């Protein structure tokens, strides 16, 4: 017995499921009278152990309609001739009792791709499912929900309209999502109040709901370990501590890892520092078009869907993209350059189709291509010994973007660091056409940069950031954060040494730690760190701008 | 009849199995009351003949719960329709008697990958296993342990949560592990006390437990050979000698060989010699973060998970990595450069996924990439005629490291010998960012180098190491150990000649050997050996440092 309370983190997708499953069953009269056909099939997918079955059970219980789970493994387990008979009688009994939510779990196993169905019985059961789904077009209220993984894995015949009209990408839960999952799974534990259940959540990046349940179980198991060997005083005094969740997190690998995260970033224009002019430009390029479509219709100009950041390597490209995504409260589909390089090397571009389809599934998206044309940098860079500017994977990206100029809800951003090797085919209308030269931080900006970076970390009042900013003239944002991290490392090394010697003194014959960062650490760090981008590079970018501006 | 005593070397993994199999069966009450779901499936894998079946039997006998071994071969041997019936009735009788440890041996054979299951009956039995494992979710206490090899070989559907939650990488036993195995298998032998049973253990690198049992049997068989043809005086006087284990070791090839070893090194900061500053740096980069996480949380700086050693080719890179791993009592997943070159040439990067997954399975790891960007050296080196700095396999390594910044228990080390060809994509936060320029040994250091190398070998008092160190100014550590080995070779050649002439004199008409190394051998060796790294190379590394520092 579960319900809407049990599901956590899944809110947008759960909201869609609520929308799509409540009205056709709880209130079928108005749909029948109006004549609009409700979605017969609802294919919700995602990585394994994401709560697909749990979501289906919860929505079925909340609706109160008749429910009949169907599992792909058990259907396939039966002898030939009995699997299709079982499916047929399941659909029949659903029809006889039909305010109904049929649920086909692991649809991929029962109905994989056409060419990877090796046996004849496999194709027979697939066709049986097809004909049952088509024949349940009758007005009897049955909704055939299906759970799978990698929706491209199932036979595309099922994805055709009239069988599975609507798709739901559950995806990985975000930070708040993982916090909700942990709250749900740690409700009946009597956990010690010392743990927060939120510090662990932010550190469980890439964990899926099943992995979070496993982490909670492993933390409880570590709590058992800490206890020796009595029946009442051990089960009553059990209180999982933060030191137990730490162990569970350490000894628990994520499963749905390195799958492109569909999440809202958490920079909100404050992690980024100043630049005082590109914030307004990004707002006007992506905030005004959505806030005031009427004006854009009046003067008759299609808003630019693409922006290609270019500048010194590391000055706030990814930070700008994340910040503008957060301001719009939109998903941010990060695509690092290494994955594009793997795309080019793997000789497989269908994964680009997959990535763009997943971006399209997330309605408000800020699809971000970091290190764009890193493929050009790989194939000889400026020399171009491999060939011309155009290359393999960027061609597929161009095709998809040309096809993705109609969604008008996925703002594509590019962050090439070497604009001179950018293939000109992508600087065309309908593609990343708007060019914003985010420059190296200025004197007035570096103080804000350091204030943002030193945030969330104690800092003494002695340090004067203005003089440090003037001292670091041509330093890039990456170099500024490197200086901050180096100073922090020096300060923590000093603190650790102080604590070690204090403990040694206390334990020996005898029987403040400077909990702040002071200017000596900052200057010591400055001695080491140096600007990583040469004057030649910024001159080259300025020359590119002059070619444009 | 076996038990915990029989299992040897497997302690960490056996400890995990004890944890995971005792409490759910011996004390099921507290788990039921608390509500945390114990791990239903426990997939323990490793190379063949590693004791997987033996470990399962031992834990089952120690628990005392009902046990029912299931073998993949015999299940598959039955006629179609009888294999699934056999599996079903096995699960049923386990349920009827269910404090239970079901054991599916050779899970790969019964349930291989989805696409490599050719017949329809194969898929039917796989689905039968899936549905049985899902349907045994009931509170009846059955634990479905499974033994396999290369866990990527089994159908990934089984690895999903709720079926096989927990994975156990048994791995090769270490030196102490092989010693324990030999002790177990040589308990009832009446072996002669002359043999130590530990000299053989250190020389059986890559041997698996089954191979160790075979080695013991072959040693006993050689002992039989030495005996001619009586029933009592031959079986009672049998005493295997070290000369028999020597033969067995010689005529016994390892099976689980050249599989990346998950073992703790044995250098413990003493095999390495001095350098007097990078020991502290490594300690502060990997020892302080784990010892004092609270300070790292206070000042708010994510500790650097990666370090990229760079310097003259051969000065203690691998030695430093092994030493820092040993100091932390952590596994050391060595990855030599040749295997990366094979990765690049093989056109297969899924093995990089496999390597990183295996590293993640070992919780405390010091993953070490020796000769990093040797691929760059292969594709034209500094010229880069092949193309840009970025290449094929290092891209996959970068992706995995980006995904491996959350484990916070696998410290990644790189030991590039040519930093100028290192792809800059790996010198970024979240990757191998901290750079430590381990230099050529100094005058004060070479004496320690020679003291360490000459250790465990007799040395005369006449040799003066300080003058030799001054004589070898720019010599690298590889060159110093080469000098030591050459001097030892000259000394042992002299000793062998002396012994040969002494034996010849004794055997002829007539009827100290200098058991030490003296300065004449050292100077004779010095005449030959010369520094292998030129002044140009060290100047280049210094220039790289100046570009950084
Ligand atoms: C959203 C959260 C931040 C990140 C992603 C969302 S971005 C977003 N959300 N909604 C929109 C608005 O889309 C459009 C509105 C229009 F009026 C028009 C028009 C017109 C006039 N036609 C003609 O004259 C001839 C036919 C075209 C649009 F595409 N955009 C958007 C689209 C494009 C660029 N920037 C923003
Ligand atoms: C272990 C045996 C030797 C070889 C392998 C083991 S190495 C090991 N074992 N435990 C650890 C500690 O991990 C971490 C601890 C932390 F406090 C933090 C933090 C923080 C602050 N967050 C923020 O401000 C914003 C979110 C991050 C960690 F990743 N490490 C380790 C990790 C990284 C580098 N060096 C060592
Ligand atoms: N959104 C969620 N809310 C609560 N629990 C979840 C959620 N997602 C996953 N889980 C947990 O993960 C597990 C998923 O198990 P299962 O249903 O077998 O796999 P799947 O969810 O992929 O079908 C459940 O035990 C559930 O408690
Ligand atoms: N304008 C900025 N404000 C604050 N931090 C910045 C800024 N630019 C760069 N950084 C720092 O640099 C890091 C991110 O670098 P990024 O700008 O993403 O590199 P790239 O532009 O090559 O993607 C962050 O840790 C961030 O703190
Ligand atoms: N950790 C261990 N302790 C004792 N013996 C072992 C160990 N590992 C392997 N062996 C030996 O290796 C053999 C393994 O045989 P078998 O069980 O058929 O293969 P596997 O162990 O891979 O299932 C046994 O005879 C056992 O004596
Ligand atoms: N600092 C050192 N102390 C002791 N031995 C060293 C040192 N540096 C190199 N060696 C010797 O060199 C050999 C290992 O070479 P290594 O440093 O691994 O080469 P590389 O650094 O190219 O991987 C060992 O036999 C070791 O005795």
Numbering used by the authors:
A (entry chain A), B (entry chain B): 200 to 428, 437 to 718, 726 to 763
What sentences appear in the manuscript?
A stable and functional oligomer of six p97 monomers assembles without a requirement for binding nucleotides. This homohexamer structure appears as two concentric rings, formed by the D1 and D2 domains, that create a central pore capable of binding protein and peptide substrates for segregation or degradation.
To investigate the structure of the R155H NTD mutant with triazole-class inhibitors, we used single-particle cryo-EM to solve the structure of p97R155H proteins with NSC804515 and NSC819701. Compared to NSC799462, NSC804515 has a 2,5-difluoro substitution pattern on the aryl ring rather than a 3,5-pattern, and a propionamide at its terminus rather than a carbamate, reducing its length (27.4 Å) compared to NSC799462 (30.1 Å). The terminal group of NSC804515 can interact with the adjacent D2 domain, whereas the 1,2,3-triazole on NSC819701 can interact with the residues on the helices α1 M and α1 J limiting their relative motion and enforcing the NTD down conformation in the R155H mutant. The IC50 values for p97WT and p97R155H mutant are also similar for all three triazole compounds, whereas the IC50 for K512N is 7.5 to 12-fold higher for NSC819701 and NSC804515, respectively. In general, when comparing these mutants to p97WT, NSC804515 and NSC819701 were all more than 30-fold resistant to P510S, N616F, and F618S and only 7- to 12-fold resistant to K512N.
